[PDB]
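Forum: Protein Structure Q&A
Topic: Joint prediction for protein chains with partners

I've read a bunch of threads here and the consensus seems to be that you should model interacting components together rather than docking separate models afterwards. I'd like to see that in practice. Below is the full input, 932 residues plus whatever partners are listed. Could one of the regulars post the assembled result?
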Amino acid sequence: MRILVTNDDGIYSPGLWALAEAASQFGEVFVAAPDHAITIAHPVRAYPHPSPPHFPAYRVRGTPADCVALGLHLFGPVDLVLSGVNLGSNLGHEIWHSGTVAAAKQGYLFGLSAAAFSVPLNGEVPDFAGLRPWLLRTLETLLRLERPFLVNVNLPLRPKGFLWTRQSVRAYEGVVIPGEDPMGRPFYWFAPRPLKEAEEGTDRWAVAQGFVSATPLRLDLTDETRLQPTL
Amino acid sequence: MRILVTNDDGIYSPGLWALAEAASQFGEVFVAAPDTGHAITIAHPVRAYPHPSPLHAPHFPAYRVRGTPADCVALGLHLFGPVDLVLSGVNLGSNLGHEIWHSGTVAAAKQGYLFGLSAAAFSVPLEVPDFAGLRPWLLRTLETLLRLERPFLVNVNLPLRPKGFLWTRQSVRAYEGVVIPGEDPMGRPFYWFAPRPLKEAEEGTDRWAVAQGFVSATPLRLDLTDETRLQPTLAH
Amino acid sequence: MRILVTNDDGIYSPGLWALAEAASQFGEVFVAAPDGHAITIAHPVRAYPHPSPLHAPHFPAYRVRGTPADCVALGLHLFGPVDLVLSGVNLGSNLGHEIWHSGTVAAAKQGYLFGLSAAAFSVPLNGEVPDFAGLRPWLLRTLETLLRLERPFLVNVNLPLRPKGFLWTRQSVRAYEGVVIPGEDPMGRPFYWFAPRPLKEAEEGTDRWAVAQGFVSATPLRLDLTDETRL
Amino acid sequence: MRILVTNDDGIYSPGLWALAEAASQFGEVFVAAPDTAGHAITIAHPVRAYPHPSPLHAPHFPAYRVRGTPADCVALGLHLFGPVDLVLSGVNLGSNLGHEIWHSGTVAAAKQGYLFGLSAAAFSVPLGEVPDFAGLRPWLLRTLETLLRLERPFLVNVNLPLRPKGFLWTRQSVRAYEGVVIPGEDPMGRPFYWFAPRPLKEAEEGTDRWAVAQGFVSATPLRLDLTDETRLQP
Ligand SMILES: [Mn+2]
Ligand SMILES: [Mn+2]
Ligand SMILES: [Mn+2]
Ligand SMILES: [Mn+2]
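Posted by a regular:
Agreed with the consensus. Here's the joint model:
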């Protein structure tokens, strides 16, 4: 099988090459990563770029979705699109605005299977050598799914297991803190907080428990419980 | 009721004031719009300044925010609290189908909903809209939305000249990839991306409705979970 | 004469239309405004016919998906031949060191480079916004005197909110003091506030001095950055 | 003396480290460069900056990666490493000749240093090749030697050919342009315009553009004052 690997962090992220290497154990790997929708207003420029295992690669001056569209052109046919490993979580409400997820979604929109990968972080750096067996296990599992699939994956720095999950959906409380710069000019701090603890079975909960979280995603944002007849 | 009006095109967009004026027929309206990401800025302080509403528009207390549309919502709920409804738009440009995912206009409405309020995004597929002629339809759509059980989150697209209204579902089409190489006047190479949908928009969808000249109203969910694959059968 | 009017704040800015109307008292006006500051090269620019505001004289106009300089290049093409390029009225000052990187000035300079006369107009502020109805007589007076100059000219104009006079001026060139105040983001990570300040008051006769006095400042600009005194 | 080195291309540019290493032959070098590739000091929000490490193969220079503009780097650099005697910006990967000087972030950083009362110089290399910094090192050293004997403070814009054969003090090339608009349509029939304005004549002898075409390192002293004083009493 032929795999396109991309991301949101750009062609220099160590997360990108960790994903490329893991994927190479399952098929031929090609890389196209940024230097979130597909650019159509103007043309995009992309350039051959060296990998750090050698992977044919292009650094694209466009969005992660542009990378997918270009990658299909440069390396078609492609069977699977993998996006990440993003340095930083992509959990719950974060999925909406994730560039990493957008690339995987684009792949899905083109009729391919796809998955996004992110590692939640904060004060510690990802040890990709340590994460490798968990990446391979995850990939192995995703490749056993009925195709095509679209999955959002988050891996704790040091996994203890794997769980399929629902997206965490929590209400938020707005918090705004007025203030002023050392020069007296006014500004505002925003620190909205979730109203409750992440629920069991959710991506956020799973990661906090030390488990790899894999959430299957839907493309249809329609709330069918509110659809209406014509009046 | 108190209404916070925002948008993604900025404080000078005629679409913003059209929405604020329409909304004023239903309650107290306050404006917080960007001076020019769709998540709330938390890593650092954001600037916001009192802003004079346009001369040829009713007065509206207003702030121009140096942040995202979602920041405007967070800020607006603080300065004009309490707020019952968040209206975002009217965006100069459509927000249909796959577009909803990346819309800053929608992100603002969604933020209000994440805070527990009712919210709607409004967009016009563009020519340039004639908000004088769209007013009656903006009023009709708003009246209709205000009869809904609360809270609600709806994405509205008004064609340039509406001939009706329809509740619709989001168009979700598969696309075929189309890349066309080219070179600029200087001989440098580039790539045109022109992906195309595999089929015509289906009836009942937002794209179809707008193409038929109808105002489209799609109720949106926040949960992106594909609930049919939580316990997937795995090949042997 | 035929006048091309553009700006940096965009097609919806009230300062743009204030300048167009004023300019219409001196020749046929055409508008091309933004929907970087150099002309976009070997990279397609989009432009659309645009309707002039309800409460304003009719003006053929286009909104351009590009830079102020692009507006000038495209404007001379769609409305040729043009004799004068006016840029503004910018919402914000363009005094002293600010001129160098000003987008409003960049458009006027582009017009000069194409062999035409041009002027940039800006209204400094911070507290309130401009009342272009009040400034109209002063805009008309400025334009009138500007149009008695030998052509081609390149002039930078700053009009205080409530002007009580007009003076030709030279750009203020002050030395600045570096001021940096450390701070912390929510995670305790460090960031820095910058508040550089001028070392002395603006010299008499300079653009910044004139505005502080309440006068409309008109500075003729050079295109040559060479410091001949050191060659 | 103490030298702050920055650039427009960012902390990973080979151009930045070539300049830093060359400057190190003349004083203590400190680096503050953009996290990634406007030009004014940021005052709206505060700016983040992080200590940046030196690789195994290179000499160590205290350095910070700055999430702001080249001018922010100079302001921050003066704070974290002050007092600083000189500000060097570059070596930019691309030219900064003639009209380009106006919109150059490389030049903006040098100019910021000058506005702070320090001597400063911007360095750029017109490139379809990859600059050979080992081959340009001698020219960087010679140029610095020349700059360091000038009366201070100074502000100079330097452009080095890929393979220089000499050095020349020059004036900025200033040419009138001819507008060229070539319409087109994208694959979906939608119209657009190509801009290809061209200078009305070839670069004059003595100018920075001419010098570089000849194979010479071009050094142009710049002025901060944009006033055209020949038209003050029109
Ligand atoms: Mn990312
Ligand atoms: Mn918009
Ligand atoms: Mn401006
Ligand atoms: Mn550069």
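The first helix of chain D runs from residue 14 to 23.
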